[PDB]
């Protein structure tokens, strides 16, 4: 087996050349050039209203592109469609399985999707002019648990999995249009580009890797973390993204500069991150910890821009509206409180 | 204001009808005690008019460290084990024991020698089968007594109709949680 090992040695010498290219672009840091800027200061957000009515732990949330409606999962098997302004439960959908890991809302504003531990991505319909809410189709193509769903449109929807495969689904047929491989872990979360062309997904392998949807190939793989990556969120311009981790660190990576820009961590923090998200401009990084609070970070100076400690029990998924008007945090205590 | 009042008059009935539906469903939800077994999958059934919603993990991969944190609302973690299956089962029982979230969740064990030199060093408190199964039983007790968590305790069983045995054991779990809720135990 000499040729296999020497071919792995050539793979090692040019990946060493890859590391040499990474040092080649490493001329400065983010903190040095962003040293001469004025931070936001202590910024205060208080709970404007709380949404009550879940019977068990809320595992997910997804906003709407109209910024009005928000969809929340739960442990009990009820995905409840909420109105944020008038705090009224607009819809309530009984799920087929009890455990659901994620929910999505259509950018058209016409469909919702549950993704659960039952290995099924199920799509529900809202625009039924006859009557109530139904199942349009359920999707079945993994041998592992579902972790996070996102929509491209009303017709093709992208799902990650714990079957090590991000996949692209089409609703008209119920089959995988393409299947993304290259990971070696549970694919935890994924976020689309703002022009919806490409998406990046975290994993178990401490490795968040960009994916091209047409090509179905591992474009580039960012490895700077220490344990499994829990949730990532894409930067609003389309050129960077920030990753949560398990070593209490947030890292923002650049797609073009191909390496770490900053590390958001304190030694006093030893708790794993559950979800991160950017604001509208991208200045603020809203990171929800297991210390039952979400810290607010400046994107450019790596300080606690604010501390947001409303919740009783830990968070599951926080989100920012598309206009940037309000931030809502789900939690494990059956109550999600919108913030502003 | 006719659009605003018609919108609110829509949400009046929609909120009251949906919150009323949830109020009806919540009493049914609390009436279910969920059990997780490791060792289509979901099964809910009746024992003495008690609803048990049970989940099988056979449709998952070997990696376990991030779908088991979804189960911190379960009442009991069943282990169906057998005979090197044993030592990795002791690894797994220790791994779920010392977990930061699952310190409150109890565990029920079921069973349904050349790796151990301690096997011959055992004293019994087929006799070879008897000394073997009580050696394994005490061996599992070694992790619980070694940790000393105090909130959850391992409940071993055997075979040679398990559902009445796990119902009565679950009754013990409910009594200990409800009793210690009054800061008594």
């Amino acid at each position, epitope marked *: 087996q000499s040729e296999l090992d020497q071919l792995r040695q050539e793979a090692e010498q040019l990946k060493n050349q890859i590391r040499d290219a990474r040092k080649a672009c490493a001329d400065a840091t983010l903190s040095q050039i962003t040293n001469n800027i004025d931070p936001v200061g202590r910024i205060q957000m208080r709970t404007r209203r709380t949404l009550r009515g879940h019977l068990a732990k809320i595992y997910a949330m997804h906003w709407g592109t109209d910024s009005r409606l928000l969809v929340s999962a739960s442990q009990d098997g009820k995905l409840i469609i909420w109105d944020s302004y008038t705090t009224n439960k607009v819809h309530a959908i009984p799920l087929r399985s009890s455990w659901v890991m994620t929910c999505a809302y259509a950018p058209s504003g016409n469909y919702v999707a549950c993704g659960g531990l039952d290995n099924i991505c199920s799509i529900y319909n809202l625009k039924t002019r006859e009557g109530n809410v139904r199942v349009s189709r359920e999707l079945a193509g993994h041998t592992g648990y579902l972790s996070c769903c996102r929509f491209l449109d009303d017709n093709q929807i992208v799902t990650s999995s714990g079957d090590t495969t991000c996949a692209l689904w089409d609703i008209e047929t119920g089959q995988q249009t393409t299947t993304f491989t290259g990971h070696t872990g549970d694919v935890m979360s994924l976020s689309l580009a703002p022009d919806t062309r490409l998406f990046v997904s975290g994993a178990c392998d401490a490795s968040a890797k960009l994916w091209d949807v047409r090509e179905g190939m591992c474009r580039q793989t960012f*490895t700077g973390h220490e*344990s499994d990556i829990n949730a990532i969120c894409f930067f609003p311009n389309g050129n960077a993204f920030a990753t949560g981790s398990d070593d209490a660190t947030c890292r923002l990576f650049d797609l073009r500069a191909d390496q770490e820009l900053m590390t958001y961590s304190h030694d006093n923090i030893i708790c794993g991150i559950t979800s991160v998200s950017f604001s509208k401009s991208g200045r603020l990084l809203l990171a929800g910890y297991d210390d039952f609070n979400c810290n607010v970070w400046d994107a450019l100076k790596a300080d606690r821009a604010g501390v947001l400690a409303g919740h009783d029990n830990r968070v599951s998924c926080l989100g920012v509206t598309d206009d940037g008007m309000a931030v809502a945090t789900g939690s494990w205590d059956s109550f999600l409180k919108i913030w502003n | 204001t006719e659009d605003q009042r018609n919108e609110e008059k829509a949400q009046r009935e929609a909120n009251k009808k949906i919150e009323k539906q949830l109020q009806k469903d919540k009493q049914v939800y609390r009436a279910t005690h969920r059990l997780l077994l490791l060792g289509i999958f979901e099964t809910k059934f009746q024992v003495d008019k008690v609803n048990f919603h049970m989940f099988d993990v056979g449709g998952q991969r*070997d990696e376990r460290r991030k779908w088991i944190q979804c189960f911190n609302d379960v009442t009991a973690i069943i282990f169906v084990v057998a005979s090197n299956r044993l*030592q990795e089962a002791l*690894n797994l029982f220790k791994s779920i024991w010392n977990n930061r979230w699952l310190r409150t969740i109890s565990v029920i064990l079921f069973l349904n020698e050349d790796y*151990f030199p301690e096997f011959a060093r055992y004293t019994t408190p087929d006799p070879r089968v008897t000394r073997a199964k009580y050696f394994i039983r005490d061996e599992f007790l070694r992790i619980s007594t070694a940790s000393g968590d105090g909130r959850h305790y391992c409940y071993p069983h055997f075979t040679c109709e398990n559902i009445r045995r796990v119902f009565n054991d679950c009754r013990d779990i409910i009594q200990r949680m409800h009793l210690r809720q009054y800061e008594l135990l």
Partner: nanobody
Amino acid sequence: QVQLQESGGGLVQPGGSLRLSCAASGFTFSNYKMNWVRQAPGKGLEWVSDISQSGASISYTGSVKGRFTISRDNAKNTLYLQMNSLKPEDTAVYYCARCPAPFTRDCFDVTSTTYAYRGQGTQVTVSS
């Protein structure tokens, strides 16, 4: 990038003794928990032995009890295993494995497939 590389291994006689040295690279080694796992010939992965974060608390498999010993050096950023009166059945691929969580007491790393945080495995083989 968390890459684990382990030197040592090779051929040992029955009754021989040998040292396996695992080097840890790309992570803050002082925080985590280490363990060694075997791949038996034509069998699944089997857990052997672990250490605490300080190195004070060590567990073993029953078969490796009294004969094998493991110790970490955080300054040397490494883990060692030493054999004492080795047994000819032990012909195995030994992997140096990291527990996934910082500041923890539990590990989930006996999985045969697709666990990331492990080495490549010194083909520790015993002669006749």
